């Protein structure tokens, strides 16, 4: 709720505190945490608007204008489909050096860059540089099995990202299936990079 | 307390999207009115990607009341270490809902302390307290369990819980124990939320 990393860091620090865990264990834990941290593995899968009446949901949605949903990719989506997608889009800041996605891991969401620049790295080799407007994920998002990511994604500068968890994206797509048909078709056009 | 944490999430959401005070107000009111711990459980697994050695150290410092149940008499250390690492806790305020009738069970709950009401429609069926396990029976099936009653906090309460999802993942790796778990749960299950 600002940057995912700071929020996650603070959750860990409470966990460590509420169980009066020793300093050497807590250090090892925090050491391991930022050594293993990546946004993709820390994403916020909550959905706090889920239990609101549809009128309240519409009034809320009406006030949002998510950059992500402005892609050509969403030109064909119905008003209701877009309102639901807009209610489950989240954000996270990302600092230089920070990992969005570590190679080999499961893809958990699609990511959109508001601002910032980022590098794609298979092993040790830039394969792409992304920036404002770029889309990140896979081709086969409805499968719905698992998607091992073929490269790492790190922030070069300070980034602000938008995302939708895949679980959240598929529940919504199941609901607007004629549109889903065009998600799958038109995705290649905006998919700035494919991690399948 | 998930309620307060979740409330903060929501106020952040309001603040960041520069939402009108009137709409903000409707949002907050409908939050306390449709709130239930079950529908807002902590589902993050912060320790999931830690080395097995570091995970076994953290687990040794835990001693969850929830796992002391006779229901886990026969579980292995690997099973108990994992069970323990995914146990969450929430403190409840009086009148606060744990579950609402009709919603899908998301977790199983243990009562470290407090008195709770079980109320199907408008009748009290039980008042629960220290040591009561709230759940369902075919917790493994598994699809969706729509709960049969409401549960609300009466005094201040302190719950431990395990999400059905994380619990199904551990039981998959401990199949013999899974079998015994399913047999032995009826023994410790205080109230059954199935329909």
PDB file of N, CA, C and O in Angstrom, chain A residues 1 8 11-12 15 19-22 25 28-30 32-33 36 41 44-46 48-49 51-53 55-56 59-60 63-64 66 87, chain B residues 6 9-10 12-13 17-20 23 26-27 30-31 34 36 39 43-44 46-47 49-51 53-54 57-58 61-62 64 85 103:
ATOM      1  N   UNK A   1       0.842  -1.204   0.000  1.00  0.00           N
ATOM      2  CA  UNK A   1       0.000   0.000   0.000  1.00  0.00           C
ATOM      3  C   UNK A   1       0.875   1.251   0.000  1.00  0.00           C
ATOM      4  O   UNK A   1       0.927   2.032   0.970  1.00  0.00           O
ATOM      5  N   UNK A   8       5.400  -5.585   2.755  1.00  0.00           N
ATOM      6  CA  UNK A   8       5.824  -6.938   3.059  1.00  0.00           C
ATOM      7  C   UNK A   8       6.916  -6.968   4.118  1.00  0.00           C
ATOM      8  O   UNK A   8       6.914  -7.847   4.977  1.00  0.00           O
ATOM      9  N   UNK A  11       5.145  -6.459   7.376  1.00  0.00           N
ATOM     10  CA  UNK A  11       4.425  -7.644   7.812  1.00  0.00           C
ATOM     11  C   UNK A  11       5.376  -8.651   8.453  1.00  0.00           C
ATOM     12  O   UNK A  11       5.069  -9.256   9.483  1.00  0.00           O
ATOM     13  N   UNK A  12       6.527  -8.843   7.821  1.00  0.00           N
ATOM     14  CA  UNK A  12       7.547  -9.714   8.360  1.00  0.00           C
ATOM     15  C   UNK A  12       7.997  -9.225   9.730  1.00  0.00           C
ATOM     16  O   UNK A  12       8.191 -10.026  10.647  1.00  0.00           O
ATOM     17  N   UNK A  15       5.408 -10.102  12.281  1.00  0.00           N
ATOM     18  CA  UNK A  15       5.484 -11.522  12.527  1.00  0.00           C
ATOM     19  C   UNK A  15       6.636 -11.814  13.503  1.00  0.00           C
ATOM     20  O   UNK A  15       6.498 -12.585  14.436  1.00  0.00           O
ATOM     21  N   UNK A  19       6.037 -12.839  17.877  1.00  0.00           N
ATOM     22  CA  UNK A  19       6.511 -14.129  18.371  1.00  0.00           C
ATOM     23  C   UNK A  19       7.849 -13.985  19.061  1.00  0.00           C
ATOM     24  O   UNK A  19       8.626 -14.930  19.108  1.00  0.00           O
ATOM     25  N   UNK A  20       8.109 -12.798  19.593  1.00  0.00           N
ATOM     26  CA  UNK A  20       9.328 -12.546  20.341  1.00  0.00           C
ATOM     27  C   UNK A  20      10.455 -13.443  19.824  1.00  0.00           C
ATOM     28  O   UNK A  20      11.037 -14.212  20.578  1.00  0.00           O
ATOM     29  N   UNK A  21      10.727 -13.354  18.522  1.00  0.00           N
ATOM     30  CA  UNK A  21      11.807 -14.098  17.876  1.00  0.00           C
ATOM     31  C   UNK A  21      13.154 -13.404  18.061  1.00  0.00           C
ATOM     32  O   UNK A  21      13.257 -12.181  17.970  1.00  0.00           O
ATOM     33  N   UNK A  22      14.204 -14.194  18.288  1.00  0.00           N
ATOM     34  CA  UNK A  22      15.529 -13.650  18.592  1.00  0.00           C
ATOM     35  C   UNK A  22      16.137 -12.852  17.440  1.00  0.00           C
ATOM     36  O   UNK A  22      15.821 -13.104  16.276  1.00  0.00           O
ATOM     37  N   UNK A  25      17.778 -14.607  14.424  1.00  0.00           N
ATOM     38  CA  UNK A  25      16.841 -15.302  13.543  1.00  0.00           C
ATOM     39  C   UNK A  25      16.161 -14.268  12.653  1.00  0.00           C
ATOM     40  O   UNK A  25      16.079 -14.438  11.443  1.00  0.00           O
ATOM     41  N   UNK A  28      18.448 -13.097   9.973  1.00  0.00           N
ATOM     42  CA  UNK A  28      18.527 -14.110   8.921  1.00  0.00           C
ATOM     43  C   UNK A  28      17.276 -14.097   8.061  1.00  0.00           C
ATOM     44  O   UNK A  28      17.338 -14.352   6.852  1.00  0.00           O
ATOM     45  N   UNK A  29      16.143 -13.823   8.704  1.00  0.00           N
ATOM     46  CA  UNK A  29      14.850 -13.782   8.038  1.00  0.00           C
ATOM     47  C   UNK A  29      14.778 -12.593   7.095  1.00  0.00           C
ATOM     48  O   UNK A  29      14.473 -12.739   5.917  1.00  0.00           O
ATOM     49  N   UNK A  30      15.065 -11.413   7.630  1.00  0.00           N
ATOM     50  CA  UNK A  30      15.116 -10.189   6.835  1.00  0.00           C
ATOM     51  C   UNK A  30      16.201 -10.235   5.750  1.00  0.00           C
ATOM     52  O   UNK A  30      15.999  -9.754   4.643  1.00  0.00           O
ATOM     53  N   UNK A  32      17.139 -12.949   4.252  1.00  0.00           N
ATOM     54  CA  UNK A  32      16.670 -13.903   3.263  1.00  0.00           C
ATOM     55  C   UNK A  32      15.560 -13.306   2.430  1.00  0.00           C
ATOM     56  O   UNK A  32      15.444 -13.576   1.237  1.00  0.00           O
ATOM     57  N   UNK A  33      14.752 -12.489   3.089  1.00  0.00           N
ATOM     58  CA  UNK A  33      13.605 -11.844   2.492  1.00  0.00           C
ATOM     59  C   UNK A  33      13.928 -10.900   1.327  1.00  0.00           C
ATOM     60  O   UNK A  33      13.282 -10.963   0.287  1.00  0.00           O
ATOM     61  N   UNK A  36      15.508 -12.730  -1.494  1.00  0.00           N
ATOM     62  CA  UNK A  36      14.579 -13.529  -2.281  1.00  0.00           C
ATOM     63  C   UNK A  36      13.367 -12.738  -2.779  1.00  0.00           C
ATOM     64  O   UNK A  36      12.594 -13.236  -3.589  1.00  0.00           O
ATOM     65  N   UNK A  41       5.955 -12.276  -6.374  1.00  0.00           N
ATOM     66  CA  UNK A  41       5.711 -13.242  -5.295  1.00  0.00           C
ATOM     67  C   UNK A  41       5.115 -12.610  -4.058  1.00  0.00           C
ATOM     68  O   UNK A  41       4.967 -13.267  -3.028  1.00  0.00           O
ATOM     69  N   UNK A  44      -0.595  -8.380  -3.946  1.00  0.00           N
ATOM     70  CA  UNK A  44      -1.768  -8.246  -3.076  1.00  0.00           C
ATOM     71  C   UNK A  44      -3.039  -8.833  -3.705  1.00  0.00           C
ATOM     72  O   UNK A  44      -3.744  -8.152  -4.469  1.00  0.00           O
ATOM     73  N   UNK A  45      -3.336 -10.090  -3.352  1.00  0.00           N
ATOM     74  CA  UNK A  45      -4.468 -10.814  -3.938  1.00  0.00           C
ATOM     75  C   UNK A  45      -5.827 -10.577  -3.270  1.00  0.00           C
ATOM     76  O   UNK A  45      -6.839 -11.096  -3.750  1.00  0.00           O
ATOM     77  N   UNK A  46      -5.847  -9.797  -2.189  1.00  0.00           N
ATOM     78  CA  UNK A  46      -7.086  -9.342  -1.588  1.00  0.00           C
ATOM     79  C   UNK A  46      -8.011  -8.796  -2.639  1.00  0.00           C
ATOM     80  O   UNK A  46      -7.626  -8.583  -3.773  1.00  0.00           O
ATOM     81  N   UNK A  48     -10.929  -6.161  -1.626  1.00  0.00           N
ATOM     82  CA  UNK A  48     -11.781  -5.566  -0.580  1.00  0.00           C
ATOM     83  C   UNK A  48     -13.115  -4.934  -1.000  1.00  0.00           C
ATOM     84  O   UNK A  48     -13.872  -4.459  -0.152  1.00  0.00           O
ATOM     85  N   UNK A  49     -13.409  -4.933  -2.294  1.00  0.00           N
ATOM     86  CA  UNK A  49     -14.633  -4.326  -2.796  1.00  0.00           C
ATOM     87  C   UNK A  49     -15.622  -5.389  -3.238  1.00  0.00           C
ATOM     88  O   UNK A  49     -16.716  -5.097  -3.739  1.00  0.00           O
ATOM     89  N   UNK A  51     -17.461  -7.439  -1.687  1.00  0.00           N
ATOM     90  CA  UNK A  51     -18.773  -7.566  -1.039  1.00  0.00           C
ATOM     91  C   UNK A  51     -19.618  -6.306  -1.028  1.00  0.00           C
ATOM     92  O   UNK A  51     -20.474  -6.147  -0.157  1.00  0.00           O
ATOM     93  N   UNK A  52     -19.374  -5.406  -1.972  1.00  0.00           N
ATOM     94  CA  UNK A  52     -20.154  -4.191  -2.036  1.00  0.00           C
ATOM     95  C   UNK A  52     -21.280  -4.399  -3.031  1.00  0.00           C
ATOM     96  O   UNK A  52     -21.128  -5.156  -3.987  1.00  0.00           O
ATOM     97  N   UNK A  53     -22.427  -3.750  -2.780  1.00  0.00           N
ATOM     98  CA  UNK A  53     -23.598  -3.772  -3.673  1.00  0.00           C
ATOM     99  C   UNK A  53     -23.169  -3.268  -5.032  1.00  0.00           C
ATOM    100  O   UNK A  53     -22.225  -2.486  -5.099  1.00  0.00           O
ATOM    101  N   UNK A  55     -24.484  -1.060  -6.959  1.00  0.00           N
ATOM    102  CA  UNK A  55     -24.584   0.387  -7.134  1.00  0.00           C
ATOM    103  C   UNK A  55     -23.346   1.079  -6.608  1.00  0.00           C
ATOM    104  O   UNK A  55     -22.824   2.003  -7.253  1.00  0.00           O
ATOM    105  N   UNK A  56     -22.866   0.632  -5.443  1.00  0.00           N
ATOM    106  CA  UNK A  56     -21.672   1.235  -4.852  1.00  0.00           C
ATOM    107  C   UNK A  56     -20.464   0.916  -5.701  1.00  0.00           C
ATOM    108  O   UNK A  56     -19.622   1.766  -5.942  1.00  0.00           O
ATOM    109  N   UNK A  59     -20.475   3.362  -8.691  1.00  0.00           N
ATOM    110  CA  UNK A  59     -20.091   4.704  -8.316  1.00  0.00           C
ATOM    111  C   UNK A  59     -18.584   4.752  -8.095  1.00  0.00           C
ATOM    112  O   UNK A  59     -17.903   5.672  -8.570  1.00  0.00           O
ATOM    113  N   UNK A  60     -18.048   3.764  -7.390  1.00  0.00           N
ATOM    114  CA  UNK A  60     -16.605   3.705  -7.232  1.00  0.00           C
ATOM    115  C   UNK A  60     -15.913   3.629  -8.597  1.00  0.00           C
ATOM    116  O   UNK A  60     -15.109   4.484  -8.925  1.00  0.00           O
ATOM    117  N   UNK A  63     -15.122   6.568 -10.948  1.00  0.00           N
ATOM    118  CA  UNK A  63     -14.144   7.566 -10.530  1.00  0.00           C
ATOM    119  C   UNK A  63     -12.723   7.137 -10.863  1.00  0.00           C
ATOM    120  O   UNK A  63     -11.753   7.821 -10.532  1.00  0.00           O
ATOM    121  N   UNK A  64     -12.594   5.980 -11.484  1.00  0.00           N
ATOM    122  CA  UNK A  64     -11.280   5.427 -11.729  1.00  0.00           C
ATOM    123  C   UNK A  64     -11.029   5.545 -13.203  1.00  0.00           C
ATOM    124  O   UNK A  64     -11.958   5.450 -14.003  1.00  0.00           O
ATOM    125  N   UNK A  66      -7.973   3.900 -14.940  1.00  0.00           N
ATOM    126  CA  UNK A  66      -6.740   3.173 -14.929  1.00  0.00           C
ATOM    127  C   UNK A  66      -6.091   3.201 -16.292  1.00  0.00           C
ATOM    128  O   UNK A  66      -6.704   2.861 -17.306  1.00  0.00           O
ATOM    129  N   UNK A  87     -11.849  -2.544 -10.727  1.00  0.00           N
ATOM    130  CA  UNK A  87     -11.956  -2.684  -9.277  1.00  0.00           C
ATOM    131  C   UNK A  87     -10.915  -3.650  -8.688  1.00  0.00           C
ATOM    132  O   UNK A  87     -10.750  -3.712  -7.478  1.00  0.00           O
TER     133      UNK A  87
ATOM    134  N   UNK B   6      -7.827  -3.932   7.432  1.00  0.00           N
ATOM    135  CA  UNK B   6      -8.613  -3.837   6.212  1.00  0.00           C
ATOM    136  C   UNK B   6      -9.227  -2.464   6.039  1.00  0.00           C
ATOM    137  O   UNK B   6      -9.335  -1.961   4.928  1.00  0.00           O
ATOM    138  N   UNK B   9      -6.539  -0.300   4.693  1.00  0.00           N
ATOM    139  CA  UNK B   9      -6.465  -0.533   3.256  1.00  0.00           C
ATOM    140  C   UNK B   9      -7.502   0.345   2.521  1.00  0.00           C
ATOM    141  O   UNK B   9      -7.215   0.951   1.481  1.00  0.00           O
ATOM    142  N   UNK B  10      -8.714   0.390   3.067  1.00  0.00           N
ATOM    143  CA  UNK B  10      -9.829   0.999   2.377  1.00  0.00           C
ATOM    144  C   UNK B  10      -9.697   2.514   2.401  1.00  0.00           C
ATOM    145  O   UNK B  10     -10.023   3.203   1.441  1.00  0.00           O
ATOM    146  N   UNK B  12      -6.886   4.065   2.535  1.00  0.00           N
ATOM    147  CA  UNK B  12      -5.815   4.313   1.573  1.00  0.00           C
ATOM    148  C   UNK B  12      -6.400   4.371   0.185  1.00  0.00           C
ATOM    149  O   UNK B  12      -6.177   5.314  -0.551  1.00  0.00           O
ATOM    150  N   UNK B  13      -7.161   3.351  -0.160  1.00  0.00           N
ATOM    151  CA  UNK B  13      -7.844   3.315  -1.430  1.00  0.00           C
ATOM    152  C   UNK B  13      -8.659   4.564  -1.710  1.00  0.00           C
ATOM    153  O   UNK B  13      -8.749   5.012  -2.840  1.00  0.00           O
ATOM    154  N   UNK B  17      -7.296   7.403  -4.566  1.00  0.00           N
ATOM    155  CA  UNK B  17      -8.092   7.685  -5.765  1.00  0.00           C
ATOM    156  C   UNK B  17      -8.877   8.972  -5.662  1.00  0.00           C
ATOM    157  O   UNK B  17      -9.805   9.184  -6.428  1.00  0.00           O
ATOM    158  N   UNK B  18      -8.493   9.825  -4.714  1.00  0.00           N
ATOM    159  CA  UNK B  18      -9.114  11.144  -4.551  1.00  0.00           C
ATOM    160  C   UNK B  18     -10.646  11.061  -4.682  1.00  0.00           C
ATOM    161  O   UNK B  18     -11.246  11.819  -5.443  1.00  0.00           O
ATOM    162  N   UNK B  19     -11.269  10.134  -3.935  1.00  0.00           N
ATOM    163  CA  UNK B  19     -12.725   9.886  -3.999  1.00  0.00           C
ATOM    164  C   UNK B  19     -13.491  10.824  -3.105  1.00  0.00           C
ATOM    165  O   UNK B  19     -13.087  11.088  -1.975  1.00  0.00           O
ATOM    166  N   UNK B  20     -14.614  11.325  -3.614  1.00  0.00           N
ATOM    167  CA  UNK B  20     -15.463  12.313  -2.949  1.00  0.00           C
ATOM    168  C   UNK B  20     -15.903  11.882  -1.544  1.00  0.00           C
ATOM    169  O   UNK B  20     -16.293  10.729  -1.338  1.00  0.00           O
ATOM    170  N   UNK B  23     -19.054   9.711  -1.330  1.00  0.00           N
ATOM    171  CA  UNK B  23     -18.741   8.344  -1.718  1.00  0.00           C
ATOM    172  C   UNK B  23     -17.821   7.678  -0.677  1.00  0.00           C
ATOM    173  O   UNK B  23     -18.057   6.553  -0.269  1.00  0.00           O
ATOM    174  N   UNK B  26     -20.181   6.467   2.139  1.00  0.00           N
ATOM    175  CA  UNK B  26     -20.891   5.265   1.757  1.00  0.00           C
ATOM    176  C   UNK B  26     -19.973   4.027   1.777  1.00  0.00           C
ATOM    177  O   UNK B  26     -20.348   2.971   2.292  1.00  0.00           O
ATOM    178  N   UNK B  27     -18.767   4.163   1.239  1.00  0.00           N
ATOM    179  CA  UNK B  27     -17.822   3.071   1.274  1.00  0.00           C
ATOM    180  C   UNK B  27     -17.482   2.545   2.688  1.00  0.00           C
ATOM    181  O   UNK B  27     -17.336   1.340   2.902  1.00  0.00           O
ATOM    182  N   UNK B  30     -20.714   0.886   4.421  1.00  0.00           N
ATOM    183  CA  UNK B  30     -20.928  -0.425   3.860  1.00  0.00           C
ATOM    184  C   UNK B  30     -19.762  -1.341   4.191  1.00  0.00           C
ATOM    185  O   UNK B  30     -19.855  -2.550   4.046  1.00  0.00           O
ATOM    186  N   UNK B  31     -18.654  -0.792   4.651  1.00  0.00           N
ATOM    187  CA  UNK B  31     -17.593  -1.694   5.040  1.00  0.00           C
ATOM    188  C   UNK B  31     -17.898  -2.360   6.372  1.00  0.00           C
ATOM    189  O   UNK B  31     -17.744  -3.564   6.503  1.00  0.00           O
ATOM    190  N   UNK B  34     -20.932  -4.849   5.924  1.00  0.00           N
ATOM    191  CA  UNK B  34     -20.805  -6.109   5.207  1.00  0.00           C
ATOM    192  C   UNK B  34     -19.563  -6.883   5.596  1.00  0.00           C
ATOM    193  O   UNK B  34     -19.264  -7.910   4.985  1.00  0.00           O
ATOM    194  N   UNK B  36     -16.824  -9.236   7.525  1.00  0.00           N
ATOM    195  CA  UNK B  36     -16.716 -10.538   8.178  1.00  0.00           C
ATOM    196  C   UNK B  36     -15.273 -11.000   8.039  1.00  0.00           C
ATOM    197  O   UNK B  36     -14.715 -10.931   6.951  1.00  0.00           O
ATOM    198  N   UNK B  39     -14.336 -13.400   5.101  1.00  0.00           N
ATOM    199  CA  UNK B  39     -14.234 -12.829   3.755  1.00  0.00           C
ATOM    200  C   UNK B  39     -13.039 -11.912   3.548  1.00  0.00           C
ATOM    201  O   UNK B  39     -12.877 -11.358   2.459  1.00  0.00           O
ATOM    202  N   UNK B  43      -4.064 -14.028   3.394  1.00  0.00           N
ATOM    203  CA  UNK B  43      -3.746 -15.173   2.529  1.00  0.00           C
ATOM    204  C   UNK B  43      -2.307 -15.176   1.991  1.00  0.00           C
ATOM    205  O   UNK B  43      -1.895 -16.116   1.311  1.00  0.00           O
ATOM    206  N   UNK B  44      -1.553 -14.127   2.299  1.00  0.00           N
ATOM    207  CA  UNK B  44      -0.126 -14.069   1.992  1.00  0.00           C
ATOM    208  C   UNK B  44       0.683 -15.183   2.700  1.00  0.00           C
ATOM    209  O   UNK B  44       0.379 -15.570   3.827  1.00  0.00           O
ATOM    210  N   UNK B  46       4.332 -15.286   3.518  1.00  0.00           N
ATOM    211  CA  UNK B  46       5.603 -14.576   3.550  1.00  0.00           C
ATOM    212  C   UNK B  46       6.831 -15.484   3.640  1.00  0.00           C
ATOM    213  O   UNK B  46       7.890 -15.131   3.134  1.00  0.00           O
ATOM    214  N   UNK B  47       6.696 -16.643   4.293  1.00  0.00           N
ATOM    215  CA  UNK B  47       7.846 -17.542   4.513  1.00  0.00           C
ATOM    216  C   UNK B  47       7.927 -18.664   3.476  1.00  0.00           C
ATOM    217  O   UNK B  47       8.759 -19.549   3.586  1.00  0.00           O
ATOM    218  N   UNK B  49       9.095 -18.947   0.473  1.00  0.00           N
ATOM    219  CA  UNK B  49      10.310 -19.144  -0.314  1.00  0.00           C
ATOM    220  C   UNK B  49      11.605 -19.166   0.498  1.00  0.00           C
ATOM    221  O   UNK B  49      12.680 -18.966  -0.057  1.00  0.00           O
ATOM    222  N   UNK B  50      11.509 -19.403   1.800  1.00  0.00           N
ATOM    223  CA  UNK B  50      12.692 -19.471   2.650  1.00  0.00           C
ATOM    224  C   UNK B  50      13.310 -20.867   2.600  1.00  0.00           C
ATOM    225  O   UNK B  50      12.574 -21.867   2.473  1.00  0.00           O
ATOM    226  N   UNK B  51      14.654 -20.950   2.724  1.00  0.00           N
ATOM    227  CA  UNK B  51      15.368 -22.237   2.757  1.00  0.00           C
ATOM    228  C   UNK B  51      14.722 -23.146   3.787  1.00  0.00           C
ATOM    229  O   UNK B  51      14.169 -22.633   4.763  1.00  0.00           O
ATOM    230  N   UNK B  53      16.015 -24.931   6.018  1.00  0.00           N
ATOM    231  CA  UNK B  53      16.695 -24.823   7.303  1.00  0.00           C
ATOM    232  C   UNK B  53      16.209 -23.635   8.104  1.00  0.00           C
ATOM    233  O   UNK B  53      16.025 -23.713   9.307  1.00  0.00           O
ATOM    234  N   UNK B  54      16.015 -22.522   7.415  1.00  0.00           N
ATOM    235  CA  UNK B  54      15.527 -21.298   8.041  1.00  0.00           C
ATOM    236  C   UNK B  54      14.061 -21.445   8.471  1.00  0.00           C
ATOM    237  O   UNK B  54      13.629 -20.913   9.503  1.00  0.00           O
ATOM    238  N   UNK B  57      13.912 -23.511  11.691  1.00  0.00           N
ATOM    239  CA  UNK B  57      14.220 -22.675  12.862  1.00  0.00           C
ATOM    240  C   UNK B  57      13.018 -21.841  13.287  1.00  0.00           C
ATOM    241  O   UNK B  57      12.665 -21.805  14.450  1.00  0.00           O
ATOM    242  N   UNK B  58      12.383 -21.159  12.349  1.00  0.00           N
ATOM    243  CA  UNK B  58      11.230 -20.342  12.704  1.00  0.00           C
ATOM    244  C   UNK B  58      10.134 -21.186  13.359  1.00  0.00           C
ATOM    245  O   UNK B  58       9.553 -20.776  14.374  1.00  0.00           O
ATOM    246  N   UNK B  61      10.164 -22.155  17.145  1.00  0.00           N
ATOM    247  CA  UNK B  61       9.807 -21.062  18.073  1.00  0.00           C
ATOM    248  C   UNK B  61       8.304 -20.832  18.166  1.00  0.00           C
ATOM    249  O   UNK B  61       7.837 -19.986  18.928  1.00  0.00           O
ATOM    250  N   UNK B  62       7.556 -21.530  17.326  1.00  0.00           N
ATOM    251  CA  UNK B  62       6.118 -21.436  17.347  1.00  0.00           C
ATOM    252  C   UNK B  62       5.583 -22.555  18.227  1.00  0.00           C
ATOM    253  O   UNK B  62       6.204 -23.615  18.355  1.00  0.00           O
ATOM    254  N   UNK B  64       1.667 -23.375  18.283  1.00  0.00           N
ATOM    255  CA  UNK B  64       0.296 -22.961  18.080  1.00  0.00           C
ATOM    256  C   UNK B  64      -0.724 -23.812  18.833  1.00  0.00           C
ATOM    257  O   UNK B  64      -0.696 -25.051  18.795  1.00  0.00           O
ATOM    258  N   UNK B  85       3.631 -22.898  10.154  1.00  0.00           N
ATOM    259  CA  UNK B  85       4.129 -21.728   9.442  1.00  0.00           C
ATOM    260  C   UNK B  85       3.036 -20.962   8.681  1.00  0.00           C
ATOM    261  O   UNK B  85       3.207 -19.771   8.400  1.00  0.00           O
ATOM    262  N   UNK B 103     -22.113 -17.604   2.973  1.00  0.00           N
ATOM    263  CA  UNK B 103     -20.800 -17.438   2.334  1.00  0.00           C
ATOM    264  C   UNK B 103     -19.961 -18.710   2.369  1.00  0.00           C
ATOM    265  O   UNK B 103     -20.177 -19.601   3.182  1.00  0.00           O
TER     266      UNK B 103
END
